[PDB]
Amino acid sequence: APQQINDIVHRTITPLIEQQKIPGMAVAVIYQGKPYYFTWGYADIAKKQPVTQQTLFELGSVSKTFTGVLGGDAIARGEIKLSDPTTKYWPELTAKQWNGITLLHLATYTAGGLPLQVPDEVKSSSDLLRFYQNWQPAWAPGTQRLYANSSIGLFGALAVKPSGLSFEQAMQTRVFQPLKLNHTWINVPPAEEKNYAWGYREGKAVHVSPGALDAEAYGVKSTIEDMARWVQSNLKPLDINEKTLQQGIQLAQSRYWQTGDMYQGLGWEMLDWPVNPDSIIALAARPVKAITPPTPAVRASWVHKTGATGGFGSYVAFIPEKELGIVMLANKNYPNPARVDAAWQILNALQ
Numbered sequence: 001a002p003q004q005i006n007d008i009v010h011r012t013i014t015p016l017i018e019q020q021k022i023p024g025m026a027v028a029v030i031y032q033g034k035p036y037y038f039t040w041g042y043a044d045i046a047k048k049q050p051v052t053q054q055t056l057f058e059l060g061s062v063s064k065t066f067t068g069v070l071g072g073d074a075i076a077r078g079e080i081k082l083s084d085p086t087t088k089y090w091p092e093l094t095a096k097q098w099n100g101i102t103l104l105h106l107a108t109y110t111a112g113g114l115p116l117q118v119p120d121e122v123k124s125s126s127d128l129l130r131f132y133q134n135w136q137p138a139w140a141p142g143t144q145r146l147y148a149n150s151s152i153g154l155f156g157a158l159a160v161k162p163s164g165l166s167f168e169q170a171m172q173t174r175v176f177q178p179l180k181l182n183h184t185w186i187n188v189p190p191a192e193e194k195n196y197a198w199g200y201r202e203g204k205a206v207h208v209s210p211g212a213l214d215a216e217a218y219g220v221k222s223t224i225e226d227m228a229r230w231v232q233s234n235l236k237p238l239d240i241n242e243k244t245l246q247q248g249i250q251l252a253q254s255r256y257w258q259t260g261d262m263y264q265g266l267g268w269e270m271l272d273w274p275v276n277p278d279s280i281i282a283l284a285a286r287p288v289k290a291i292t293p294p295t296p297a298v299r300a301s302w303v304h305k306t307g308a309t310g311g312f313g314s315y316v317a318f319i320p321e322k323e324l325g326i327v328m329l330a331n332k333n334y335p336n337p338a339r340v341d342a343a344w345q346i347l348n349a350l351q
């Protein structure tokens, strides 16, 4: 832990924890390709359990990066094509609004207005089909971006259909295991419960609730160590031995659409580096310009993903061209601006 990294990290995170009243936090900085860990506070306030490098945190929306890479891997395997109509994988989706909506639109939130959340009412596979059949797009496909769990969630569920594997089995065997993310789970096993941090919302300990397509959109839990490893894998995909996976990682970081200064990948979001911090709301509908054809992963990019659950807030960002990256996991959902400002403060300093 070079003193410079210790210094920038502690000087940035200590005040953050104090201002945001965060009970527990873990950070990993990947510098010149190697990880450095830092931990503060509590994983469980009541039982006085501290945050350690083995504490599991709910990644919330950061889970989408895993879904995007798993989708990229299925593409790489030839199991699906992003240009394929959604109906090719869900024939029961006969409603006419689906004509022209492809797996690319689902993966990138450009299907035409799918909702941020699947309604809680949807439980069964039957209610889900009914939800998508009855959904009425406000816009034609590929014209506007509206971040949506019901959009990338459907993408994740359909991308694994050809494999015959459940989404969780596919994720475990095709992404977690090959990358040695041995403490990353969609469902936390009883043996690992001792390490599962509690999230805190209004001072109350809470864990994420089950919901339709939760695994695919916001259901992964992981340790600061596994997330540092996930960041290393995304920083340098070429070191990954599994060909299809190496490929999927690259596909998830290609630039499919542009909205202002940001580009939409599969899961990951990117901005050209260098980026102004200030340049990095329940619903923000934004027109998008298609990148035809998609730009392959650009090394000079700030690649990132923010995510939260009712009780946790997380952020991951990295710059391929600098072999630099960071992961910040907390068991309190605090403002996104504060997460990005802290990450930029640290990475700019190490830049």
Ligand SMILES: *C(=O)[C@H]([C@@H](C)O)[C@H]1CC(SCCNC=N)=C(C(=O)O)N1
Pocket: 060, 061, 062, 116, 149, 217, 218, 306, 307, 308, 309, 310, 314, 333, 336
């Ligand atoms: C990630 O996808 C999640 C969710 C839609 O599954 C979003 C939710 C939030 S915070 C929304 C309002 N909550 C207030 N306590 C975030 C975020 O990272 O800010 N991600």
